[PDB]
Amino acid sequence: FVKVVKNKAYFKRYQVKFRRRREGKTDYYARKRLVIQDKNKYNTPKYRMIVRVTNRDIICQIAYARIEGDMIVCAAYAHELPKYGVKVGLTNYAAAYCTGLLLARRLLNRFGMDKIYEGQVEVTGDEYNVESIDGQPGAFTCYLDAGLARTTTGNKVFGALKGAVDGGLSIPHSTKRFPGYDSESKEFNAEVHRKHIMGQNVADYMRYLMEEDEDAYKKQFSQYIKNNVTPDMMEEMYKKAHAAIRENPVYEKKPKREVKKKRWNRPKMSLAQKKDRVAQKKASFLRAQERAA
């Protein structure tokens, strides 16, 4: 045989990692460099933009770290976009730009800074950075918390970044991870970036599946056909969406209805029950043994 590794001794010496690390959600190496503030700042919050793209949604939050836990000043989710006209495709790059733009304008509107710091209303895709206006409240500033996402060129977390800076957030960044930075020649053409922002890269893919195979097209886009969003009206849909966001970024929570107060989960068994089951298991094991005897 072979010696057992996971024995009594193994667990006596085992030191678990942090809960968020055992679950695989937080990189505490990068978090230590992100959240903590210089000691000569004294409770000056260090805001950071949290972008987490999931399978069916895009979550953009802005938080600053406190001792008891991060505090979210405002958040914008992708599942709100149907209000502003973006019916389907709530996780593509063009949707990420909207969620970032929504988060920006929603934050500024809670600071009375929406009139100032408009940003880029006419989206171009170039290297834009808002600078503070003298005599006015300083422009808001945060940093991007990519999390565990591999940050290569064209990652959707940078789409929300572009949406935020065009909304009026002073986020330090470089125009190198945007979709449009040609790697072998080291330049950036804002035009192709403007394509991904207005969702043109997927529009042609619907057009590509037009003459190639329509049945496979119906299989790759079903709710696009269900919501009647053809590649024709996609670019204007986002422009209508952006304008609808900048004019009403306020969020109205859903009305909270009182619920019947039931329990779907299984309550934890008590000691008396746990201790009595053993008496039944042993007794039944005997009263089944003399039946064989």
Binding site: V278, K281, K282, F285, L286, Q289
Partner: protein, 205 residues
């Protein structure tokens, strides 16, 4: 040969075991710590006699080897060759040093390893013997003959435990009836009420 045992009797230094730092130590003279019918179960040797120390001193590995033989020899004549089981419960781990001469005197006088010795405490069992309770007066004479090979004074005590186990002879037999104790070769395994219930099934059937 080697110095008298008066030179190394008192626990004078910190324990100096044979290790990475103290290498080159000659082997101890005692190598066999169990003898007799050591391949015997727990139900045939109830009586257990001790040789308890009464001094915080050092017992050489040569005295341990000599006392093992003298106690072995007497039991063989008395209780036959297989009617007992001797267990020396002191292992010599402390290394003593000697600053042998051949003049230098005390310049750089850190000795070389001479031999090995066992640090015994007060009330600590030196040697134990289990046998049939019939042969009671035969072990007290075997241990009485073994004291003369040891410096200091020792008491011979007949334990209330059953054999070499840690359970009293008044409670041993029953704790085997309700199966708190399962005979495991020379000793016994205590069985609590804490394991998985499937192990309880394996015993009660």
């Amino acid at each position: 040969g080697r110095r008298p045992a008066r030179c190394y009797r008192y626990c004078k230094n910190k324990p100096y075991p044979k290790s990475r730092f103290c290498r080159g130590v000659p082997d101890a003279k005692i190598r066999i710590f169990d003898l007799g019918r050591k391949k015997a179960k727990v139900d045939e040797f109830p009586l257990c006699g001790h040789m308890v120390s009464d001094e915080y001193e050092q017992l050489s590995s040569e005295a341990l080897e000599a006392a093992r033989i003298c106690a072995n020899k007497y039991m063989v004549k008395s209780c036959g060759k297989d009617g007992f089981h001797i267990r020396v419960r002191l292992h010599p781990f402390h290394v003593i040093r000697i600053n042998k001469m051949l003049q230098t005197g005390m310049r750089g006088a850190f000795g070389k390893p001479q031999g090995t010795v066992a640090r015994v405490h007060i009330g600590q069992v030196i040697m134990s013997i289990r046998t049939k309770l019939q042969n009671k007066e035969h072990v007290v004479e075997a241990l009485r003959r073994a004291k003369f090979k040891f410096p200091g004074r020792q008491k011979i005590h007949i334990s209330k435990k059953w054999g070499f186990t840690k359970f009293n002879a008044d409670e041993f037999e029953d704790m085997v009836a309700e199966k708190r104790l399962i005979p495991d070769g020379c000793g016994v395994k205590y069985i609590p009420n804490r394991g998985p219930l499937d192990k309880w099934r394996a015993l009660h059937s």
